[PDB]
Design a protein around this ligand. Structure first.
Ligand SMILES: Cc1nnc2c(N[C@H](C)C(N)=O)cc(-c3ccccc3Oc3ccccc3)nn12
Length: 124
């Protein structure tokens, strides 16, 4: 079995722009979620080979994770904050789609998402 290539994190043809909102997303949002006790499964792409989840990438067609988001913020991949917010939302939704309500992993994602939304309420 094999994992897919990770989501794109570098593309010199994509126009980039630093904004104070993107800086907040890195300095506050990403860095706070990263240290949460439930962040670890989300700090890198799902390794479906290591976890023996052969259907994962048959079902999840837009993978996303905070390791990828961290790379996208630290080597600025984005034009606007909404693109980054969308990446977080894709990460959460993938987990809810692949797993069952009330599963441990879903409860972990829900805790991260609650925190994420609280921080987004203070986006500058
Ligand atoms: C993201 C994302 N979305 N779904 C899953 C997922 N699903 C499987 C079917 C499941 N038993 O819940 C597992 C993991 C995952 C990643 C790295 C290391 C261990 C992992 O297993 C965990 C399982 C429960 C809680 C914590 C970790 N990450 N993950």
């Amino acid at each position: 079995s094999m994992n897919p290539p990770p989501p794109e994190t570098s593309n010199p043809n994509k126009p980039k722009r630093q904004t104070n909102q993107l800086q907040y997303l890195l300095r506050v949002v990403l860095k706070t979620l990263w240290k949460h006790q439930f962040a670890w499964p989300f700090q890198q792409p799902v390794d479906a080979v290591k976890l023996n989840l052969p259907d994962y990438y048959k079902i999840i067609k837009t993978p996303m994770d905070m390791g990828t988001i961290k790379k996208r913020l630290e080597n600025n991949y984005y034009w606007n904050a909404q693109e980054c917010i969308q990446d977080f939302n894709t990460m959460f939704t993938n987990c809810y789609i692949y797993n069952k309500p009330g599963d441990d992993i879903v409860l972990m994602a829900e805790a991260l998402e609650k925190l994420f939304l609280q921080k987004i309420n203070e986006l500058p």
